[PDB]
Design an enzyme around this catalytic site. Structure first.
Site, PDB file in Angstrom:
ATOM      1  N   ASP A  40      24.590  55.150  22.925  1.00  0.00           N
ATOM      2  CA  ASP A  40      24.349  54.551  24.230  1.00  0.00           C
ATOM      3  C   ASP A  40      25.671  54.247  24.927  1.00  0.00           C
ATOM      4  OD1 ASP A  40      23.216  53.143  26.422  1.00  0.00           O
ATOM      5  OD2 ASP A  40      21.562  52.458  25.151  1.00  0.00           O
TER       6      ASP A  40
ATOM      7  N   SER B  17      13.854  53.243  27.245  1.00  0.00           N
ATOM      8  CA  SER B  17      15.143  53.043  26.598  1.00  0.00           C
ATOM      9  C   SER B  17      15.156  51.758  25.783  1.00  0.00           C
ATOM     10  CB  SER B  17      16.252  53.010  27.656  1.00  0.00           C
ATOM     11  OG  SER B  17      15.947  52.071  28.677  1.00  0.00           O
TER      12      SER B  17
END
Length: 279
Positions: A39, A224
């Site tokens: 990420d 997410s």
């Protein structure tokens, strides 16, 4: 173990029913398992990680998470208060800059990095990768996710926030990895959650409270953020020996909460991530 007044996401994955606030989990809590958070990076110094989080790779000038989204996802995986696997080891692969954007080639490099770095890590219970990112379809990004899954890491990926079929989004569309849609606290498909036959599971995705940069917390929404729930659940499941990286996503689908979600499109699985923990 019972964490009272936990985030609704945590309480939901340990629940046959919505609307509860206590997260139940085996106290092993992902001990000996690893979760790569691919990420924006992780604020490893955040007290919620208890020294279990660490940057292992960045493709930018710093491994610092100047965005917070990777710190948030790492928090949902294995932070102490906000996390599924509260004792897992969290590894930061900053493939996204502090604006949250990353070239696919960098994202592909980070995935091949994890497939190799896991051999540089001590994960006797299993390796998990949580990819809370996604863009338009890329058969190269899919193959990079297929490789990471092939190497012996679970690949949990976000379905995407486009309210569309995730077949047109990568690495969501890679069939071998675990594509996670998002749900809200009322067991509705998170309005933004992508759907379609490629989705494997739903996780808590709407108003997910977890860690943030600056040693803080905040609640934000996204597939997410269902993804770290499933990545944390995986690492939790591998630590109890209930499944392996190659078989975790199906396992979670096998042991999910069936037909409990509302507004699931015809053809999309109606499966909600469920730890099946019985106190």
């Amino acid at each position: 173990a019972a964490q009272t007044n936990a985030p609704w996401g945590l309480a939901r994955i340990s629940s046959t029913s919505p609307g509860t606030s206590t997260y139940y989990y085996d106290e092993s809590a992902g001990q000996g398992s690893c979760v790569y958070v691919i990420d924006t990076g992780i604020e490893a110094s955040h007290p919620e990680f208890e020294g279990r989080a660490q940057m292992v790779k960045t493709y930018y000038y710093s491994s610092r998470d100047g965005n917070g989204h990777g710190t948030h996802c790492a928090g949902t995986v294995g932070s102490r208060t906000y996390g599924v696997a509260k004792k897992t080891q969290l590894f930061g692969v900053k493939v996204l800059d502090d604006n949250g954007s990353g070239q696919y080639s960098t994202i592909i490099a980070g995935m091949d990095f994890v497939a190799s770095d896991k051999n540089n890590r001590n994960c006797p219970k299993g390796v998990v990768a949580s990819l809370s990112l996604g863009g338009g379809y890329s058969s190269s990004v899919n193959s990079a996710a297929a490789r990471l899954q092939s190497s012996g890491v679970m690949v949990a990926v976000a379905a995407g926030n486009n309210n569309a079929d995730a077949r047109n989004y990568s690495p969501a569309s890679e069939p071998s990895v675990c594509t996670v849609g998002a749900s809200d606290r009322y067991d509705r498909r998170s309005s933004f959650s992508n759907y379609g036959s490629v989705l494997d599971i739903f996780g808590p995705g709407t108003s997910i409270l977890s860690t943030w940069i600056g040693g803080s917390t905040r609640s934000i929404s996204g597939t997410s953020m269902a993804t770290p729930h499933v990545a944390g659940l995986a690492a939790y499941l591998m630590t109890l020996g209930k499944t392996t990286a190659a078989s975790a996503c199906r396992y979670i689908a096998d042991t999910a909460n069936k037909g409990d979600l509302s507004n699931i499109p015809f053809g999309t699985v109606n499966l909600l991530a469920y730890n099946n923990y019985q106190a």
